[PDB]
Amino acid sequence: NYEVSEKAFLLTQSKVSIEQRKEAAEFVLAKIKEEEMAPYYKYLCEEYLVNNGQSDLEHDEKSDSLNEWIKFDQELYNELCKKNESKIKELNEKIQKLEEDDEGELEQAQAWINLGEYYAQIGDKDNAEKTLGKSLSKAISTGAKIDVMLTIARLGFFYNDQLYVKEKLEAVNSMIEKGGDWERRNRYKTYYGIHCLAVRNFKEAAKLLVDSLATFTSIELTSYESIATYASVTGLFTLERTDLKSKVIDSPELLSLISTTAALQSISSLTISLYASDYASYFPYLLETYANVLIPCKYLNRHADFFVREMRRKVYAQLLESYKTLSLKSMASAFGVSVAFLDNDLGKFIPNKQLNCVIDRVNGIVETNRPDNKNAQYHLLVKQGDGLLTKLQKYGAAVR
Amino acid sequence: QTNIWEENWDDVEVDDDFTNELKAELDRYKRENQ
Amino acid sequence: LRPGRIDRKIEFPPPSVAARAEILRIHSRKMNLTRGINLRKVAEKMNGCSG
Report the C-alpha gap between A266 and A225 in whole angstroms: 14
Report the C-alpha gap between A247 and A370 in whole angstroms: 30
CA distances from A94 to A86, A109, A110, A130 (A): 12, 11, 10, 17
Report the C-alpha gap between A221 and A191 in whole angstroms: 9
Torsion of CA B8, B11, B13, B16, to 10 degrees: 80
Residue type, A7: K
Task: Render A244-266 in DSSP notation, one character per residue.
Answer: HHHTTT--HHHHHHTTTSSS-SS
Contact between residue A149 and residue A66 where contact means Cβ atoms under 8 Å apart: no
Q: Facing residues of A327 across strands? A: A365
Contact between residue A35 and residue A122 where contact means Cβ atoms under 8 Å apart: yes
Tell me how many degrees the CA angle A9-A14-A15 measures, rounded to the nearest 5: 140
What residues of chain A lie within 8 A of the CB of B5, using their CB?
Answer: 199, 302-303
Report the C-alpha gap between A315 and A303 in whole angstroms: 18
Peptide bond before A16: cis, by omega within 30 degrees of 0?
no
Assess C33–A contact: CB distance below 8 Å, yes or no.
yes
Report the C-alpha gap between A326 and A260 in whole angstroms: 41
Whether residue B5 and residue A302 make contact (CB cut-off 8 A), yes or no, is: yes
Report the C-alpha gap between A346 and A372 in whole angstroms: 23
Whether residue B6 and residue A163 make contact (CB cut-off 8 A), yes or no, is: no
Per 3-state DSSP, chain A is made up of helix, strand and coil in percentages (nearest 5) of 60, 0, 35
> Strand locations in C1-51, DSSP E?
none
**DSSP letter (8 states) at residue A360:** -
Where b means 16+ CB within 10 Å and e means fewer, A24-53 reads: bbebbbebbeebbbbbbbbebbbbbbebbb
Report the C-alpha gap between A94 and A108 in whole angstroms: 9
Report the C-alpha gap between A271 and A277 in whole angstroms: 9
Handedness of CA C16, C22, C26, C29 (dihedral sign): positive
A114 φ, ψ (degrees, to nearest 5): -60, -50
Identify which of A228, A222, A260, A226 has the alpha carbon closest to the alpha carbon of residue A247. A228
Identify which of A146, A206, A152 has the alpha carbon closest to the alpha carbon of residue A182. A146
Residue C36: burial class (beta carbons within 10 Å; 0-12, 13-18, 19+): exposed
In A281-320, the residues whose Cβ lies within 8 Å of chain B are: 283-284, 286-287, 290, 302-303, 305-306, 308-309, 312
Report the C-alpha gap between A381 and A92 in whole angstroms: 58
Report the C-alpha gap between B28 and A132 in whole angstroms: 57
Angle between helices A142-158 and A183-195 (to 10 degrees): 20
In A186-225, the residues whose Cβ lies within 8 Å of chain C are: 214-216
> Residues with Cβ < 8 Å from A180, sequence gap 6 or more?
A142, A146, A149, A187, A188, C29
Contact between residue A234 and residue A206 where contact means Cβ atoms under 8 Å apart: yes
Report the C-alpha gap between C13 and C36 in whole angstroms: 32
Report the C-alpha gap between A98 and A222 in whole angstroms: 32
What are the residue ranges spanned by the domains of chain A?
Answer: 1-322, 323-369
Report the C-alpha gap between A295 and A266 in whole angstroms: 14
Residue A281: burial class (beta carbons within 10 Å; 0-12, 13-18, 19+): middle
Identify which of A203, A226, A204 has the alpha carbon closest to the alpha carbon of residue A214. A226
What residues of chain B lie within 8 A of the CB of A234, using their CB?
Answer: none
Residue type, B20: N
Whether residue C34 and residue A183 make contact (CB cut-off 8 A), yes or no, is: no
**Conformation bin of residue A300: beta by default, left when phi > 0, alpha when psi is -120 to 50:** alpha
Measured over all CA atoms, what is the biggest interatomic distance in chain A, rounded to whole angstroms?
Answer: 87
Helix (H) / strand (E) element for A227: namely helix A224-238
Report the C-alpha gap between A313 and A320 in whole angstroms: 9
For the range C47-51, what are the long-range contacts, defined as Cβ-Cβ under 8 Å and sequence gap of 24 or more?
A: C47/C17, C49/C20, C50/C15, C50/C20, C51/C15, C51/C19, C51/C20, C51/C23
Q: How was this structure determined?
A: cryo-EM
Whether residue A336 and residue B28 make contact (CB cut-off 8 A), yes or no, is: yes
CA distances from A204 to A38, A208, A325, A382 (A): 35, 7, 33, 24
Touch between chain C and chain A (3+ CB pairs, < 8 Å)?
Answer: yes
Identify which of A37, A33, A53, A51 has the alpha carbon closest to the alpha carbon of residue A5. A37
Residue type, A220: E
Whether residue A309 and residue B16 make contact (CB cut-off 8 A), yes or no, is: yes
> Residues with Cβ < 8 Å from A263, sequence gap 6 or more?
A225, A229, A292, A293, A296
> Residues with Cβ < 8 Å from A83, sequence gap 6 or more?
A36, A122
Contact between residue A141 and residue A168 where contact means Cβ atoms under 8 Å apart: no
Assess A382–B contact: CB distance below 8 Å, yes or no.
no
Q: Facing residues of A358 across strands? A: A367
What residues of chain A lie within 8 A of the CB of B17, using their CB?
Answer: 286-287, 290, 305, 308
Report the C-alpha gap between A282 and A179 in whole angstroms: 40
